[PDB]
Symmetry: D2
Subunit: 366 residues, 4 copies
């Protein structure tokens, strides 16, 4: 009976008589920094999530144009720290937030530039749809950046970046900046003005210790809150996804849904998410795959890595190409449709929702 009621259809039984005494009470509320629940229940406590953030798509071709022009006109260095352009959700009041929890940006580093070293409580990762040439130095450990690589920079790790070539590179940054600003957890420290090691090894020290499947160094027996892997290289991700599709061909369980291969990047000390606030995945859909529509608590962002296809959000189809980016705010129904084989990088605030027992998932047909 009452379970089908919403805030529009429910009887409003707390409507006081509009008298001078009531207006005086309400005036007194304002003077005393008091705001009654009864005038705002439905907004404070909706039937289901109703984000101020809206679903939205940014074209890579547009992001690249603006990043390149920024490369001409704006020098990178101290103070501003990075030449990064945050994707700003139209629904979030002028804040540089792609969602209420996450920052997503395109960053551009021109020939031979250095972005100086700093650290901050905010967790961060880099992802590269295309390019090479930059190394990012994380606690003194140079990490090469290449197409298809996920690079991590967990909170409070010193990091700076350098272009070792005569050619520009762009990539995307994800951070829990919006969550951290609203929740007041932000600390920041300036490090050196130049990265602490200009060497450019093929593979970082973190990788050389931690990227052997199923093996753990005896010197690393303590679990970490964030992954000690600095780089999740394209080769491994590509091979994982191929094997899932091959295993499917062979009638063996592997794919998460038919024609839908997918992995989660994990902290190898625990098997959990890469960082406390941020979950990263990579999806590969066979040509013609259409995912079942999901509603999920919290926000996610995808970047198209390869192939052609579309996303549906709130019933609306938007065609997508290589590098395009979209955000799905909390509880917005979404699905992906593959035209060709369709590869996507994904990040979300799901580790926050799951840690606090706020996660819910509705899946079409299930």
């Amino acid at each position: 009976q009452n379970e089908k009621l919403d805030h529009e259809s429910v009887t409003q039984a707390m409507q006081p008589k509009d008298t001078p005494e009531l207006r005086a009470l309400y005036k007194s509320f304002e003077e005393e920094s008091i705001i009654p629940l009864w005038t705002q229940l439905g907004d404070l406590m909706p039937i289901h999530p109703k984000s101020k953030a809206v679903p939205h798509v940014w074209k890579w071709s547009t992001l690249l144009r603006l990043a390149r022009k920024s490369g001409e006109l704006v020098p990178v260095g101290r103070g501003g720290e990075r030449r990064a352009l945050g994707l700003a959700n139209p629904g979030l009041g002028g804040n540089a937030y792609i969602s209420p929890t996450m920052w997503a940006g395109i960053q551009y580093l021109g020939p031979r530039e250095t972005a100086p070293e700093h650290r901050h409580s905010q967790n961060a990762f880099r992802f590269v749809v295309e390019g090479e040439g930059v190394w990012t130095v994380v606690n003194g450990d140079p990490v090469r950046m290449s197409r298809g690589d996920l690079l991590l920079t967990p909170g409070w790790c010193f990091h700076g970046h350098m272009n070792d070539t005569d050619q520009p590179m762009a990539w995307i940054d994800g951070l829990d900046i919006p969550f951290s600003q609203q929740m007041d957890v932000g600390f920041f420290e300036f490090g050196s003005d130049r990265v602490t090691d200009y060497a450019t090894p093929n593979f970082s020290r973190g990788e050389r210790l931690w990227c052997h499947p199923g093996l753990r160094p005896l010197s690393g027996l303590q679990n970490t809150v964030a992954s000690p892997i600095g780089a999740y290289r394209w080769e491994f991700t590509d091979r994982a996804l191929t094997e899932q599709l091959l295993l499917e061909d062979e009638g063996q369980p592997a794919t998460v849904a038919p024609g839908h291969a997918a992995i989660r990047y994990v902290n190898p000390t625990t098997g959990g998410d890469v960082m406390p606030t941020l979950r990263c995945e990579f999806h590969r859909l066979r040509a013609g795959t259409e995912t079942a529509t999901r509603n999920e608590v919290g926000s996610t962002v995808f970047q198209v890595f390869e192939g052609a296809g579309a996303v549906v959000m709130n019933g609306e189809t938007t065609k997508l190409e290589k590098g395009d980016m979209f955000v799905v705010p909390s509880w917005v129904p979404w699905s992906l449709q593959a035209e060709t084989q369709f590869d996507l990088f994904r990040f979300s605030d799901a580790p926050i929702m799951e840690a606090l027992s706020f996660m819910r998932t509705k899946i079409e047909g299930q």
Copy 2:
């Protein structure tokens, strides 16, 4: 060297030449929903937390006057749901938030009133500095409300309240409403218009199963995300705190600091916090005790339960009496000073900060 720099003293090296091409770039950013990092680094990523919320104190005598007047002029019922007055931080832009994460309110239920049944993903607790007469029915289990009691209503539990007497009662509510609204995790369901059981037992079913020290029913071997204890009664809290002070008198370790007894209300299935987002404590300071100044990540709220004393926040002393309430936003230096024996109820968002590895603590002298 660079570790002592802040956003005011650092060199700003990303100041572009102010030309028509630059203004055209910046205009293009606006059209494309792009906001560059370099114009806002320092605000997005402060050196240490700088909350928009400000420290603030609400007098119980004022809260009571406004709650009582609301009792005359505003009927309680469906739609508005509760006659509750939220403490609204002056720094939080007109939102009914005591801090960026927490709602705190005074609720008033007059003679023989019922507040109807509903549930919501938001976690909630009731605390009572004074009064008796109300029972709150939580998933059908009537729970008596009395002076000094902490009553819990974890997320998604049906709850409504009824005054069984001819006398009014007031109490405080705490909820993770602000966190839940900003993060988009809110669900809500209307239940019955009248509580489902009007019986008024001395002790609830939850208590009769779970409030025997060190004992666990074989029917309750599964751990819960929130405490199954609906009521943490004043008797136990009072006795715990007395025993700590007695143990101190006897030269035995017990108190958390000298003359400072304190407990945390816990989920007995895990030994952890009562609910995923909210931590509740109770403190008792010997006359003359002055706590060491703390900076802590995240916000806390205290209500004075008994005795006289003061709080210091940002170096500013405010004298406190029975029922007065104050909020300490993230990283604000705070201490308590006991004039007489000084009893306080405390809640905070610390389980959020600790789950996500954002907690930090600075203690004066340590």
Copy 3:
């Protein structure tokens, strides 16, 4: 097909030709400390557990006679340490083991005696069906021993005992002595020759900190591997079990099965078992209750605390009275039958089996 085969009915296909060369091979095995699998598969790896321990019952009246006579003839003191009589399973080859994992003993302390202080890696508890007068001093904290009390002495805690009266007292000890001896984990240290504190408070320091339901001292926020509660007093256990039966009367879920109230004694820092190797429970069956037959991996021991009834093991009924003790070895089918209201104390090695993922449970009808 092959799933119904056992070691008696399976084809034995590794029967070598009995030749001089084979006997020479087998002789060589002996010289080289080699024992082939094929001559002993079925014994090493049975179809289901087949303990050398047998179900067995010890009469309290017999245990008391022998303990009392030991009180006359054997002095208690250093070296031998305790006047304790271990229940020795007839199936375990003369070892003083009630089961392959547990020691159970009756201990007797005469008027004004002291049993001196020591510690050992082996975990221990005391349980009292009857008597008063002894205090056990655990890390310097005197703990009163009374009828119905469970007293804990986790591994590596100094403990000694003293009779403060002119009257003898007996109780039962449980320890993981057999597990610890076979697995080679035993350490032992002699402490003082007399307990370190002869005071006899009603309640220990551990209890005064930890026995308030749902409350945790801020000085005790670190979780422990064993419970910091030294005494689980009869009052709480009795009240817990009564409330379950009352809740059942009221149509409310509480009892573990119909007419079967039961609790587990738990570590309040975690909600888990009292000690890493040993699980303690207390059961109360309504007159006429018959439990469903269980097979469970690992061994358990019960002592009858009050009332009359029977146990069935391997289909065999043995009538039981106050104080009688029985052991149920691994996978032996067992049930309890209540003649009157039937109260039993229970301990087991279940935390070992569950930690190592060896637990299985078969329940009749389910």
Copy 4:
């Protein structure tokens, strides 16, 4: 004072007068299945672990001779199940136990033989110092066996083995058979008489899903009690150990001690041990390395994989060659000395000791 006392030097104060009444008491103890503590304290509860197992070394050349001769004279098949020769500790009374917890055996499979399919609660792994040709089929998933590979068969997984060539292969088995027999946790089921899949892929399905560093299939988000990796191939182990030694050369932390590279094989869903009862490691010592002497609770076994060196146990040096095996019982002081670069495979019961909080470690110089 009393801390330096042991069971040989302590005063024995419970020596009763040897009278007819005492001998009658003691006789009565025997009739009633009672064994007093005071006549056996020191044996039941030693000052530190004193295993019945003794340190011992088995020569690979001897193991190979006996396995090969067994290959001629004993057919492999149903009933006996495997042609495996257990290493029997001289101190363990004729039981086929290398230590009180572990079985270690050499298994031999001749040209074209099949060992039929079964499962058991006991956990198992295979390790190969030399050879190729056998596949082991684990829950229907064929897993190739090659030099340097660790193959897993967690408890209750169906497994059988087949030689796909005209050449014999030998390897070592480790199981928690002794623990499981003494603790009564053993279940066993006969599966098919022939393996269920004779195909011989280079890599199993488990590996194709789980052996990509830092990546987890979305279809495998549930944690497992044992590793889903069926094969830890030599390539990865070799590369891990090389990188540690290279990182050391570069002044970077990696090795567990100087010139001592080492990894632990882990469950990738948790970062923990491969199976609940058994820990597997692989060590590589630079020529000339001498490890610091350790005492550790519980037993370990090593097999020499490559190079030459020695072990010291109880102060006694034994020179070791490729394939030689040794056991170090609980609390025996041990160290390894590398003559050439010295590679060893290691297994132990450490996950049992650590789960139950019985682990202790003494390291020389630290």
